[PDB]
Amino acid sequence: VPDSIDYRKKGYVTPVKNQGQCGSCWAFSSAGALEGQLKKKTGKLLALSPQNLVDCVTENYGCGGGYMTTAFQYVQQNGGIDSEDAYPYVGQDESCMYNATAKAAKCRGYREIPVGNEKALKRAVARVGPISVSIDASLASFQFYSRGVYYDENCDRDNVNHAVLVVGYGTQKGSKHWIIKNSWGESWGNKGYALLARNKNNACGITNMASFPKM
Amino acid sequence: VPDSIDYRKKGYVTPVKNQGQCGSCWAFSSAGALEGQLKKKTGKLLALSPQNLVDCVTENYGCGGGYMTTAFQYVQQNGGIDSEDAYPYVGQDESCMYNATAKAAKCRGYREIPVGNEKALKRAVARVGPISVSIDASLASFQFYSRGVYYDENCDRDNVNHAVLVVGYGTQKGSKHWIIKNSWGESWGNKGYALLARNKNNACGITNMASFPKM
Numbered sequence A, B: 001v002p003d004s005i006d007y008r009k010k011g012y013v014t015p016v017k018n019q020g021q022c023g024s025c026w027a028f029s030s031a032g033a034l035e036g037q038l039k040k041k042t043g044k045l046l047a048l049s050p051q052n053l054v055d056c057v058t059e060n061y062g063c064g065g066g067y068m069t070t071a072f073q074y075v076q077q078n079g080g081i082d083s084e085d086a087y088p089y090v091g092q093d094e095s096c097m098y099n100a101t102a103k104a105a106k107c108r109g110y111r112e113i114p115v116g117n118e119k120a121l122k123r124a125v126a127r128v129g130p131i132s133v134s135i136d137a138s139l140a141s142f143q144f145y146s147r148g149v150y151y152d153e154n155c156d157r158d159n160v161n162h163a164v165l166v167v168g169y170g171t172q173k174g175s176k177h178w179i180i181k182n183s184w185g186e187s188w189g190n191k192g193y194a195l196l197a198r199n200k201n202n203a204c205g206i207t208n209m210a211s212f213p214k215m
């Protein structure tokens, strides 16, 4: 269980994208966790298609929200997910334009993190790879974040509303933290990433609804 | 376990190639099995590089022969194998031009089939996918094969000499058989493939030295 890991360094994370006015955070987190596991099983890093999931996960609400665990199950039961090149993101709802030949990755299921167990998520990021998580992104202080180890005592520990991708953890200026990839472009945060308070009583509900895919 | 399986049908096999005057049959067999497992885990069929292995598997003899098991072990310790596009075949010895960004597949080790146990190999083809094997391909009846279920009682069950890739099994005109991909071009055999006698006492030593990579 290392003290510090940054899966960007290790070639596991695709470039930050911008979801725009579509509410498709859940699909960027899914594709992000699956990108990491495809890299771990293979040697190649390949950006997979959130649009694939936006259009096709019927048990989700397209641009109006969804879950990662059900996204994973779609790609499992669907037996594949297309690549972003095959199925580029357009940020608006449409019919399932899935094409089974442009298939770039598969899924054998998912496992969920124990709710409220930051010590557990620390091991999971280190062992598995980038972990899909859900947070409270509703406060103004989180939307306009740019630097430092985010910590807001009004961040709701009990309810979440926005999906991101945990890509590491560590410590900066003596404050332990999670490293997150958001889907708000590189203009947001620190080149699209942030550092959130860690081991501080589940700040913003990071482990309230976390999962990762099996491959 | 099915009566019949044909991984050509399922998109698991790349097109037949021609090894030429280089003795690198073992490398096409290896890459073929790695192609099969990459398709099973990810869904994409991508032709991998035998030249990668010819140049870089130091414990093999390059164009002068080699083993699939030692090829697999290279890709494990090397942490990757390049794609045929990145590292095209030239049918001649040269220096290890491996490029880790062109990594297209990895290996976690290998497993061997019980020697002389066709019933076991049948399970592996059905369960795992295409299995690298070695046979006696030295006789004229095999060189001039074009159609039907190959069977020569003079085929050496004890000393194999040429690597192929078992890509299925089944039955034709009441003769149980293996389906193999050879590396002698499409002009040989039935568009580069053949059918070898199965459950006829380990014909041509088909199970004498069979393995597949772990991923």
Ligand SMILES: *[C@@H]1O[C@H](CO[C@@H]2O[C@@H](C)[C@@H](O)[C@@H](O)[C@@H]2O)[C@@H](O[C@@H]2O[C@H](CO)[C@@H](O[C@@H]3O[C@H](CO[C@H]4O[C@H](CO)[C@@H](O[C@H]5O[C@H](CO)[C@@H](O[C@@H]6O[C@H](CO)[C@H](O)[C@H](O)[C@H]6O)[C@H](O)[C@@H]5O)[C@H](O)[C@@H]4O)[C@@H](O)[C@H](O[C@H]4O[C@H](CO)[C@@H](O)[C@H](O)[C@@H]4O)[C@@H]3O)[C@H](O)[C@H]2NC(C)=O)[C@H](O)[C@H]1NC(C)=O
Pocket: B083, B085, B086, B099, B100, B101, B102
């Ligand atoms: C080892 O293998 C490496 C990988 O091989 C490739 O992969 C597979 C498919 C193989 O089968 C090969 O066929 C491939 O070559 C080899 O590395 C490749 O080498 C090529 C030649 O040196 C490179 O192409 C040349 O470079 C550009 C094209 O740029 C490409 O870059 C990436 C590649 O994935 C991508 O676009 C992104 O580029 C930036 C990547 O960092 C990215 O930067 C981000 O920018 C953000 C802000 O904008 C932000 O700040 C981020 O922080 C920042 O990182 C960009 O934003 C893009 O998103 C595209 O694929 C893109 O195509 C091009 O200029 C060159 O064209 C020349 O061609 C002609 C001359 O004939 C003429 O027009 C000009 O002279 C022109 O200059 C050329 O295409 C390729 O990029 C490179 N790929 C990688 C991944 O490294 C390597 O050579 C091999 N080495 C050896 C020794 O074998």
Ligand SMILES: *[C@@H]1O[C@H](CO)[C@@H](O)[C@H](O)[C@H]1NC(C)=O
Pocket: A086, A099, A100, A101, A102
């Ligand atoms: C699916 O994608 C492939 C390219 O990978 C393309 O050749 C094929 O026509 C596509 N199928 C459609 C558009 O139905």
